[PDB]
Design a protein around this ligand. Structure first.
Ligand SMILES: [Mg+2]
Ligand SMILES: [Mg+2]
Ligand SMILES: [Mg+2]
Ligand SMILES: [Mg+2]
Ligand SMILES: [Mg+2]
Ligand SMILES: [Mg+2]
Ligand SMILES: [Mg+2]
Ligand SMILES: [Mg+2]
Ligand SMILES: [Mg+2]
Ligand SMILES: [Mg+2]
Ligand SMILES: [Mg+2]
Ligand SMILES: [Mg+2]
Ligand SMILES: [Mg+2]
Ligand SMILES: [Mg+2]
Ligand SMILES: [Mg+2]
Ligand SMILES: [Mg+2]
Ligand SMILES: [Mg+2]
Ligand SMILES: [Mg+2]
Ligand SMILES: [Mg+2]
Ligand SMILES: [Mg+2]
Ligand SMILES: [Mg+2]
Ligand SMILES: [Mg+2]
Ligand SMILES: [Mg+2]
Ligand SMILES: [Mg+2]
Ligand SMILES: [Mg+2]
Ligand SMILES: [Mg+2]
Ligand SMILES: [Mg+2]
Ligand SMILES: [Mg+2]
Ligand SMILES: [Mg+2]
Ligand SMILES: [Mg+2]
Ligand SMILES: [Mg+2]
Ligand SMILES: [Mg+2]
Ligand SMILES: [Mg+2]
Ligand SMILES: [Mg+2]
Ligand SMILES: [Mg+2]
Ligand SMILES: [Mg+2]
Ligand SMILES: [Mg+2]
Ligand SMILES: [Mg+2]
Ligand SMILES: [Mg+2]
Ligand SMILES: [Mg+2]
Ligand SMILES: [Mg+2]
Ligand SMILES: [Mg+2]
Ligand SMILES: [Mg+2]
Ligand SMILES: [Mg+2]
Ligand SMILES: [Mg+2]
Ligand SMILES: [Mg+2]
Ligand SMILES: [Mg+2]
Ligand SMILES: [Mg+2]
Ligand SMILES: [Mg+2]
Ligand SMILES: [Mg+2]
Ligand SMILES: [Mg+2]
Ligand SMILES: [Mg+2]
Ligand SMILES: [Mg+2]
Ligand SMILES: [Mg+2]
Ligand SMILES: [Mg+2]
Ligand SMILES: [Mg+2]
Ligand SMILES: [Mg+2]
Ligand SMILES: [Mg+2]
Ligand SMILES: [Mg+2]
Lengths: 77, 50, 112, 100
RNA sequence: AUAUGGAUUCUUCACGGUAACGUAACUGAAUGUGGAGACGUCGGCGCGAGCCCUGGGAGGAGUUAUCUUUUCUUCUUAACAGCUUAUCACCCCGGAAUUGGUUUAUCCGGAGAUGGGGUCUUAUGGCUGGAAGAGGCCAGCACCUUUGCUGGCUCCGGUGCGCUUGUGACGGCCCGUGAAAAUCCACAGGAAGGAAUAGUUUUCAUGCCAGGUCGUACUGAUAACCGCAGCAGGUCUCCAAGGUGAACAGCCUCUAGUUGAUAGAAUAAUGUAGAUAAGGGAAGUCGGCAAAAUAGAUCCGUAACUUCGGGAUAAGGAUUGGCUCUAAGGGUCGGGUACGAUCAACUUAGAACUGGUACGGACAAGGGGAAUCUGACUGUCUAAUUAAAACAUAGCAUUGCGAUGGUCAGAAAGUGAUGUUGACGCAAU
RNA sequence: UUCAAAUGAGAACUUUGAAGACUGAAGUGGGGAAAGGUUCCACGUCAACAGCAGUUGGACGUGGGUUAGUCGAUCCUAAGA
């Protein structure tokens, strides 16, 4: 039910006690007027709401995923 | 109907159970005298007044 | 063409049974029932909807922070500012003229 | 702001069974593609050819792939070829002519 | 149930804004007060939603002797959450006659207008999260099989006295002024409690546990109910597409649903229901009973009499198809402190041409007039032989009564109606 | 209303296909309230019943089916009791 943009805040969520699972979605999407680009939504299933953080920059996306806690049960796709 | 009191549903239930043919094995008992179920009821031949 | 049924068992058009047509992700029309609209709280003095205050149906006011139930002047959510302007002025002026009456009628008692 | 558009037709499958003539076919386009309401008007505004095994329409004017399908349906209808050949989309704007 | 984070505190119980008011929070007992719950009806005007119409594009389908860049169809987005969004109202600056502002509807201003700046409610809408992973539409492989598997596309717009419903700011009406309670919040109050070596705070965020009992099928009617019955009767309600047209009419159609209702052969009399008839035209008959005639719209024309409101569609007339043109009626933009440019609407009137003089072409749709009797009117009744002149009604007039009372109830009563009443009342003619 | 197939001892009447029409969204459509009470659904099936028929049925036989913290009741008050 929540969207999130502070990439710092996000991280802190995923290390909260109640957070057992997560999921990464990937969408094809097109930019501005012309070409496409790879959108990636990071979803953290909290106890009472699903936080989802969108990273348009596919770059930011990769070296985000390797930040993800080694203990979190991530759902890929 | 369509939204009943439990008392009525109960009666309703009891009256479904009673709505069966005579159990044919009774016909075989010494001195048995019941031919058929003579209190059978049908929803469109006799209303049950609740 | 897509028509639509009530959702609760009550088939009549009562103030508690208003409907809204809605297009679902299935690509179809579905009714939704609709709570009666909330009305704006009113000033206790003059009677207009008092501004600054949220408007919900009554029990919904207990699921809402106290800031949604006031403005920050004396008699916040209760009376409406202009009404409190009047209240202050008159209070002052009257307490003042009390002092006037006291000393005037006091002097009566000294020359009569 | 003018925009050119490309439309391919993979007429191989039924061409290779003798029953299709990419020849008079792309002529049918040439002849009946209406331009601002008329035939053979596509004056350097629509070009049409046949890479041996594939027809190609290139258009600068009012032209839709729906229209293309409507034309060659009439061709296939014209030469008794319905029952036998479908106009079909594969990828968008890239169309083929299925046999069986 | 409760901890963790935040907030608050050495100026203990937050700051900011001139203000309307702002916010993630920001102690608050007795008591008192205020709000919500919570309320008629109709009219037009404004906005929403869904439906309707419709352009481009991407798909599938139909027709193709001939014609049609065609006909039909898919292109969707829930509760909930973040931000944003409003007519109204309110604030600050200001000080108004040459009075201004202003609604379709004439209301507003020295008790502060017009102007400029701001505050507010969040109906409603927009963007994002929910959410494309769903659903919708296709194509390409697979095979008795569970049944898969793999790809695509699911996009961008337009229009309005439209239709239904919603809601707003207003306006009309009343000897009619159009429920209650549970429940929720707020404010006034300040009993009290509470920090610096550390306190106060769960109306701010996040976190934990739990939510019993009964109904839930189906019918809802020319067969699931009531009429002895699978009875042409009766029985409360919501949703509601396209054309014609004023229209939720009639007539035709899409979606859905039916195609139920003994059947066959014949077509005598007499029927029942539907039509027509030369010449005459109510001569029929108690009686024009039945039937026929009339009918829409536009224009023209319209008597006696009248409570001046009517009578009135009085009466009486012309006109109306198709096709092709003409003219008038609007929106939106930039113009130093006269015009230009484009997009989108069926109304109304004029003018040609045209036909076996037809044209509200089916459907739909008033006969009119002159008098007597009678009830003023609208309204009411004898379910199942009387709808009327009968009853009612407003209007008029008479009667009783100031409560220890009038009229009426009850076997009685520390009983009851009028009475939440008081003669501009209640009761009785 | 019609043709044909299928099924069945048996077909004007069942099933499926085809054609012809109808209701025409003020519905013969999609749901509900009262009332019914299992009529719903499936399999079997024709003695009676459905004022011809029957292989069909709201019939007969045997079974299956109605899941809630949020939909109602339950709470509140109304005339009144
Ligand atoms: Mg009955
Ligand atoms: Mg229901
Ligand atoms: Mg506030
Ligand atoms: Mg607020
Ligand atoms: Mg603060
Ligand atoms: Mg109160
Ligand atoms: Mg009140
Ligand atoms: Mg009420
Ligand atoms: Mg459509
Ligand atoms: Mg809701
Ligand atoms: Mg302003
Ligand atoms: Mg300001
Ligand atoms: Mg209505
Ligand atoms: Mg009023
Ligand atoms: Mg309140
Ligand atoms: Mg004390
Ligand atoms: Mg809390
Ligand atoms: Mg308990
Ligand atoms: Mg149901
Ligand atoms: Mg039925
Ligand atoms: Mg009986
Ligand atoms: Mg009947
Ligand atoms: Mg039905
Ligand atoms: Mg009959
Ligand atoms: Mg016969
Ligand atoms: Mg004659
Ligand atoms: Mg004559
Ligand atoms: Mg005579
Ligand atoms: Mg005569
Ligand atoms: Mg005679
Ligand atoms: Mg007579
Ligand atoms: Mg006579
Ligand atoms: Mg007559
Ligand atoms: Mg005639
Ligand atoms: Mg007259
Ligand atoms: Mg003419
Ligand atoms: Mg013009
Ligand atoms: Mg009368
Ligand atoms: Mg009358
Ligand atoms: Mg009678
Ligand atoms: Mg009698
Ligand atoms: Mg009458
Ligand atoms: Mg008189
Ligand atoms: Mg006594
Ligand atoms: Mg038959
Ligand atoms: Mg019809
Ligand atoms: Mg109709
Ligand atoms: Mg029927
Ligand atoms: Mg039902
Ligand atoms: Mg029943
Ligand atoms: Mg059945
Ligand atoms: Mg038999
Ligand atoms: Mg029967
Ligand atoms: Mg029979
Ligand atoms: Mg028989
Ligand atoms: Mg049975
Ligand atoms: Mg059973
Ligand atoms: Mg509820
Ligand atoms: Mg309970």
């Amino acid at each position: 039910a929540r969207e999130i943009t502070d990439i710092k805040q996000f991280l802190e969520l995923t290390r909260r006690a109640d957070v057992k699972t997560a999921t990464v979605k990937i969408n094809k999407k097109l930019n501005k007027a012309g070409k496409p680009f790879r959108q990636t939504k990071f979803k953290v299933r909290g106890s009472s709401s699903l936080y989802t953080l969108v990273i348009n920059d596919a770059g930011k996306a990769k070296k985000l995923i390797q930040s993800l806690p080694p203990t979190l049960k991530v759902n890929r796709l | 109907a369509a939204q009943k009191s439990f008392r009525i549903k109960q009666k309703m239930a009891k009256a479904k159970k009673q709505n069966r043919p005579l159990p044919q094995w009774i016909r075989l008992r010494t001195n048995n005298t019941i031919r058929y179920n003579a209190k059978r009821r049908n929803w469109r031949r006799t209303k049950m007044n609740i | 063409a897509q028509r639509v049924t009530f959702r609760r068992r009550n088939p009549y058009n009562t103030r508690s049974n208003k409907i809204k047509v809605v297009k679902t992700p299935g690509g179809i029309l579905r009714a939704q029932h609709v709570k009666k609209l909330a009305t704006r709280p009113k000033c206790g003095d003059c009677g207009s909807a008092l501004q600054g205050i949220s408007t919900l149906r009554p029990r919904q006011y207990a699921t809402v922070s106290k800031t949604h139930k006031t403005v920050s002047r004396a008699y916040g959510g209760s009376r409406c500012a202009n009404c409190v302007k009047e209240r202050i002025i008159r209070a002052f002026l009257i307490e003042e003229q009390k002092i006037v009456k006291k000393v005037v009628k006091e002097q009566t008692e000294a020359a009569k | 702001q003018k925009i050119a558009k490309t439309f391919t037709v993979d007429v191989s499958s039924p061409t290779e069974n003798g029953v299709f003539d990419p020849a008079s076919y792309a002529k049918y386009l040439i002849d009946h593609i209406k331009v601002e309401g008329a035939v053979g008007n596509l004056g350097n505004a629509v070009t049409v050819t046949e890479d041996g095994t594939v027809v190609t329409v290139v258009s600068t004017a009012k032209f839709s792939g729906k229209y293309l399908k409507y034309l060659t349906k009439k061709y296939l209808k014209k030469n008794q070829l319905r029952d036998w050949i479908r106009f079909v989309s594969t990828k968008t704007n890239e169309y083929r002519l299925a046999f069986y």
